[PDB]
Structures are given as C-alpha cells and as structure tokens.
C-alpha cells in the first residue's frame, strides 16, 4: 500500500473516461497534436516555408488550410521551441514550421499511448489483445509516411503537410515523381483497403439478411438481447446462400472474423513497406524491357508509356511552385506539352 | 481501360479534367473505403479478442466453433466492456444487429456517393 | 486506335505487354457512342483495329 | 534415454491449402512482371 | 522483349517452393485421418 499502488488504484478507476497509466502518455500528446493542428490551421501561415497561405485567418477554407512542413533548409531539425533555430521565440517557431514537428512528434507518442491504452484496458478487462495488434497497421503507416519517408529525403519539407488539399498534393507528387501507382506494395495495400471495405459491407449485409425472427416487430433491431446465448442470424443459411451465389462461403465464424482483422491490417503494412523504399527513391518507376523497345521502336505505345508522359508533365509543371527553395526557372519553351493544350 | 496501367491512366486524366480529389463525393468515397477498412479491422479484432476459450494452446482457436452451433462463439458483453472503456461507454455497440447494420451501411453509402 | 488518331495502342501480352501494362483497350474515338458489334465491321481485322472487343466485353 | 515428449503432429486442412495456393499464385502473378522487368 | 533472364526461374521457384510446402503438409494431414 505504497504510493505506487495507491496511484495504480486511482489511474485504473472505472470512470466515464478511463485514464490508466497509459493515459499519462496518451492524453497530453493526443490533445497537443490535436491542439496544434487546430491552432495552426486557424492562425498560422506557410508563407516563409512554402510561399503559401494556409490558415482561416489568411482566407483559406477547411479544404485548403494546413499545418505545413518546415522549409527545406531546416533539414531534419527537431525544431524544438528552445532549439538553435527558433531560440525560444514562439512567433518565429511558428513561421519556421515548428508546429509540424510538434504535431508529428506528439502525435507519434500519442499513437504509442493509444496502443498502450488498448493493452492496458484489455489486460484489466480480461480479453485478448487483438485490437492492439490490429492498431499496429495505422502505426506503421503513420511512422513510415510521416517519419521514415522524409528522413530518407533531404528534409521534413517533403513529408505530408497536415491538411486536406496538402495531402492531395502529396498523392499527386508521388504519382509524378515515384510513379507510386505502379508499386506492388501499394497495390497490395489497395487490395487490402478495398478488400476490407468489401468484407465490412458483405458481412454486415449477410448478417442483417439472415436474421432469425426473434420478436414480432417490423424493426428487427429490438429483437436482440446483448446477453442472449443464441446466435442472432443463421450461419447455416448464410453459408448456403453464398455457396450457391458465389461458389464458396464461410463456414467458421472464428476464421471469418479473423480474416476481417487480417485483410486491412496486412494491406496497410504492405503499403508501409513500399513507402520505406520511396524514402530512398527506390521506386518501381519503370519496366526496363518496355523502355528498350519504346526507345528503338516509335510505333510501340502502351498505357505504361502513356502514364510516364503524364508524370513528366506533373514534374515540370508543379516543381517550380512546389519546391520553391530550388529556384527552378523553366522557360515556356522547355515545358513538355502536347499539341494545342 | 480493362487493364491495370490503363486504370491508372483513367485516374490521372480524370484528375486533370475534373479535379476529383477536391470533389466531395470522392471524399465521401474515401471515407467510405477508409472507414470500411477501419470497421472491418475493428469488428474482426473485437470478436477475435473476445472468443470464448474452447481449445488448447496446440490447436487453432478456430476449432472452438462448429459450423451450425447454436450458441455464440464470443462474448459480446466482454467486447463491449473493452471497447466502451477504450473510448467511452456510449461510443460502443451492445446490440449486434445495430452493429452489423452499421457495418453494412457505412461503406455501401460511401461508395454510392463515389459512384 | 483508342483516340481515333490512327495511333494504335498495344494492350495484349503477345504484343509486348506484361500483366501490369496489358489492357483491353477502349474503342476508337471515331466511333464515339456508336454501337460497334462485329457484324457492323467489314472484317474482324477492322473490328480489332477500332476497338470492338471493348464494347462486346 | 526416452523419446522426446515435446513432439506434436502438424496439420493443414484442405481449405488452408486452397487459401495458401491462391495466395502464392496471385503473389506470383503480381510480381512476375517485376521479376521479368 | 528484352526481359530479365532470371525472371523465369525466380518466378518458377517462387511458385514451386511455397506451393510444394503446403502440398506436403496437406497430404500428410489427410493420411492421419
């Protein structure tokens, strides 16, 4: 009954919002990551790092505001408030991009906090910790995209900015520069996310249309008791339906719900690996054999060669404004352009 | 196109001609698909978390369910008690019919919009 | 000739494509929204150059 | 010296075979283009 | 096309080695019962 155990008692009390030991990491970091983003999207410019307006104050709307990344000249500085760049000046810190690292790093530790919460609550309540395990996929995506990726490049400047349209620009940057759609780790990720949504919709639909009649009302929601022992829908009729509709169906309720965990978690993990490669510009940009044929044979055209022309347009047309620290000056005559347009 | 790279060509040219990323019905589509993958993983992780012990360590937990058994194979009150505390109580379902309908509705509707 | 400019696009494995780059290529822009069943073509060769399989599929 | 008591039989049911072959074949269909390059 | 010459054997073993591993495990399962 020392102070540690008294404190354990207090952290683990059953309250409207469970705290736990993990709450000490989680709650400040979650709130500061959240606070930083709302603060910056409301009040803070990106003028000095990007040449961009990016707050409500400056005229931006919800789709265009962002907490933008620091200038390329910051390298991978932590950009601590009390560090050599801001030197404790809160205002300067904001104009140099300090809220980006602030949000990224607190968000990172908040994500750790949340996964520890999942472990903490699972142990106290007595369930297996598969929801924590599943959450490793979001963690992998976050650290790979927001931390590893820009650490392989020149600076934090090329990480994503925390903003709706700024993320859209991230999507298009990766197409034009990395040809990211051609990457099989992204393709596996797509299949896992779209497979997940499929499984979500089809399992929800199946259950709701194989319900047992368990009360008399036209609304079937009332006829479920959360402590009934009996299954509420017929696995046997669902299995027959999909067997005759689709050829195969689930027969094991445990495999089914494990598979639903497995598909999207794996897909996210796979996309994370592809992004780690792109940190190093280790892309699947090209198919060598197509390029050798196409160079020698001007009548050979595929959807593959058509998309690289698109990428070339993207790079030349967006780079001066998207990478202002490079002082690209492209005369009108060097810009790649098709006829008329 | 009926092809993998042709699909990408279609996407890119659609973005230049329609700025689909800035279109709200695509954003709901992303919310439908991201959200469906999320709820897919949640529902699968919550059920798996709360399986009732029916097997030994040397055997797949899956042999604890026999196709067509009457009793449920997991403890939805333990799942609800876990998930209610992870967020707060009234953010977690106790009704399995509402839960599965929600799982049906979210991605279906988000994909209606994107279509 | 997907875009109707006599610039034919190779879609199939035997014509230099792999699984990732291959496609059945959309029908010709010269056709627009016109119905192009096989029997409206002078020959299967014509139907193939102009993208008729895409419509059938 | 007795036989080792820690041995266990190992199993793979038919459905697991079907799932496993499907994974490998699809993985092969996806990466083969990149192996040939 | 001028494709990578070892792509073929890479592919053949990528299919063969894991598939064979599963087949071994399945067949010796079936002959237990």
């Amino acid at each position: 009954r020392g102070w540690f155990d008294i404190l354990d008692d207090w952290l683990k009390r059953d309250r409207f919002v469970f705290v736990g030991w993990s709450g000490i990491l989680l709650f400040p970091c979650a709130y500061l990551a959240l606070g930083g983003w709302l603060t910056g999207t409301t009040f803070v410019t990106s003028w000095y790092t990007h040449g961009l307006a990016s707050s409500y104050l400056e005229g931006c709307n919800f789709l265009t505001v962002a907490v933008s990344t620091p200038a390329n000249s910051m390298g991978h500085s932590l950009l601590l408030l009390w560090g050599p760049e801001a030197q404790g000046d809160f205002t300067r810190w904001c104009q140099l991009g300090g809220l980006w690292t602030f949000i990224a790093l607190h968000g990172a530790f908040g994500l750790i906090g949340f996964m520890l919460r999942q472990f903490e609550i699972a142990r106290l309540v007595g369930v297996r910790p598969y929801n924590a395990i599943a959450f490793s996929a979001p963690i992998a995506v976050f650290v790979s995209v927001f931390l590893i990726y820009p650490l392989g490049q020149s600076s934090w400047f090329f990480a994503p900015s925390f903003g709706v349209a700024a993320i859209f620009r991230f999507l298009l940057f990766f197409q034009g520069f990395h040809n990211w759609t051609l990457n099989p780790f992204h393709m596996m990720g797509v299949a896992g996310v779209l497979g997940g949504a499929l499984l979500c919709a089809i399992h929800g639909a199946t259950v709701e249309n194989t319900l047992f009649q368990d009360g008399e009302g036209a609304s079937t929601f009332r006829a479920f008791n959360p402590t009934q022992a009996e299954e509420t829908y017929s696995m046997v009729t669902a299995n027959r339906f999909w067997s005759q509709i689709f050829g195969i169906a689930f027969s094991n309720k445990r495999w089914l719900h494990f598979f639903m965990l497995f598909v999207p978690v794996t897909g996210l993990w796979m996309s994370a690996i592809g992004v780690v490669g792109l940190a190093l510009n280790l892309r699947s940009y090209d198919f060598i054999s197509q390029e050798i044929r196409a160079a020698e044979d001007p009548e050979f055209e595929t959807f593959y060669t058509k998309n690289l022309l698109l990428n070339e347009g993207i790079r030349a047309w967006m780079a001066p404004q998207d990478q202002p620290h490079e002082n690209f000056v492209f005369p009108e005559e060097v810009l790649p352009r098709g006829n008329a347009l | 196109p009926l092809g993998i790279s042709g699909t990408f060509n279609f996407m890119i040219v659609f973005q230049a001609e329609h700025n689909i990323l800035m279109h709200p019905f695509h954003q709901l589509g992303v919310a439908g698909v991201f959200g469906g993958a999320l709820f897919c993983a949640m529902h699968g992780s919550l059920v798996t978390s709360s399986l009732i012990r029916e097997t030994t360590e040397t055997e797949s937990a899956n042999y604890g369910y026999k196709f067509g058994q009457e009793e449920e194979t997991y403890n939805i009150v333990a799942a609800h008690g876990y998930f209610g505390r992870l967020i707060f109580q009234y953010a977690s379902f106790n009704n399995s019919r509402s839960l599965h309908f929600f799982l049906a509705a979210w991605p279906v509707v988000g994909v209606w919009f994107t279509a | 000739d997907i875009d109707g400019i006599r610039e034919p696009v190779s879609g199939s494995l035997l014509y230099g494509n792999n699984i990732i780059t291959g496609a059945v290529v959309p029908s010709s822009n010269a056709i627009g929204l016109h119905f192009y069943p096989i029997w409206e073509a002078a020959s299967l060769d014509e139907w193939l150059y102009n993208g008729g399989p895409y419509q059938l599929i | 010296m007795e036989p080792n008591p820690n041995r266990q039989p190992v199993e793979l049911n038919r459905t697991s075979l079907y799932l496993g072959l499907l994974l490998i074949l699809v993985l092969a269909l996806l990466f083969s283009s990149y192996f040939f390059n | 096309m001028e494709v990578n010459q070892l792509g073929l054997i890479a592919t053949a073993l990528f299919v063969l080695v894991p598939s064979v591993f599963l087949i071994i495990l399945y067949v010796q399962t079936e002959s237990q019962q």
């Binding site: - | 196709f67 | - | 499907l22 074949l25 | 792509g7 073929l8 053949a12």
Partner: peptide
C-alpha cells in the same frame, strides 16, 4: 517465355477455382 508464364499462372488460378468450389471440404452441421 514471359507470355507463357503469365498465362500458366492465370490458368492454375482457374483450375484452383474449380477445385475449391466443387472439391471443397463440405460444411457439415456439427
């Protein structure tokens, strides 16, 4: 050689579908 490889893998997937549907582990009630 690459064409034959792609069609071979595709053809094995179709064969597998046939076996998975018609020669499945039949689901038996308990």
């Amino acid at each position: 050689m690459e064409t034959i490889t792609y069609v071979f893998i595709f053809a094995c997937i179709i064969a597998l579908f046939f076996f998975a549907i018609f020669f499945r582990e039949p689901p038996r009630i308990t």
